[PDB]
Amino acid sequence: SKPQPIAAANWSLSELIDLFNSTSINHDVQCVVASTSSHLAMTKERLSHPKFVIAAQNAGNADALASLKDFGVNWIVLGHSERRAYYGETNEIVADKVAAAVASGFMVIACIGETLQERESGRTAVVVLTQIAAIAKKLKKADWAKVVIAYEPVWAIGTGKVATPQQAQEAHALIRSWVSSKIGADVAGELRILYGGSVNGKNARTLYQQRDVNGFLVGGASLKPEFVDIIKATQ
């Protein structure tokens, strides 16, 4: 059925780490904690759960990517909404960043998603396909084993306005079909497409039940104990 699911936290911090460490996860799930360099070290050494991995948020360049590795960070979050909005990161720039991360043996979480405006304008599909297509342009079939797609409606990020399950699934299904048709069924079949944007402990379970949802990218709810519930919704 579904490939291994991911539960990612996009960053009391020690309190949460302690909580995570004491937490028993019994199913096959990959947990991730993405942090700012500021808290990278701490998390790096406080976090000891076997099912958790730490991820970085951004790498300026080659040197930065190397130092991460030297530090043991093997995962990275790219193309997050604020980057695209306020950091001059265009579709193409993100694609290039995704490829450079891959080239350095990184596991990547590439984020995509439309704005409210794009959503009102009935332009969702195109936007989404355009963003993914620019990504796909710089990867080769084998590289896809290192990619994770995080679909996040910009209007749902931090707003309290989560996508209905029908919205999410429609989005995820679109992405997968394109992947399957442009890249290949095998890749498609294996690809983890996460949902992100106001996920919480109550809405998680229903979202996860959608055929094409493989987990989440969680901001707010990850700074709380409910995150644990988020992890369990992937059972």
UniProtKB/Swiss-Prot annotation:
Quaternary structure (record): Homodimer.
GO CC entries: cytoplasm; cytosol; glycosome
Protein EC: 5.3.1.1
Active site annotation, chain numbering: 80, 152
A biological-process GO annotation: gluconeogenesis
Reactions it catalyzes: D-glyceraldehyde 3-phosphate = dihydroxyacetone phosphate
MF annotations from Gene Ontology: triose-phosphate isomerase activity
Listed Gene3D superfamilies: Aldolase class I
Annotated binding of substrate, by residue: 10
Note in the entry: The enzyme contains a high proportion of positively-charged residues in beta-barrels V and VII (compared to the homologous regions in other triose isomerase sequences). Since 2 clusters of positive charges located at precise distances on the molecular surface are common to 4 glycosomal enzymes, it has been speculated that this might represent a signal for entry into glycosomes.
Keywords recorded for this protein, A-Z: Gluconeogenesis, Glycolysis, Glycosome, Isomerase, Peroxisome
PANTHER family attached to this UniProt entry: TRIOSEPHOSPHATE ISOMERASE
Domain of life: Eukaryota
Pfam families: TIM
Predominant location category: other
Pathway recorded for this protein: Carbohydrate biosynthesis; gluconeogenesis; Carbohydrate degradation; glycolysis; D-glyceraldehyde 3-phosphate from glycerone phosphate: step 1/1
PROSITE patterns to which the protein is assigned, alphabetical: TIM_1, TIM_2
Organism: Trypanosoma brucei brucei
Similarity section: Belongs to the triosephosphate isomerase family.
Cellular localization per UniProt: Glycosome
Protein name per its UniProtKB record: Triosephosphate isomerase, glycosomal
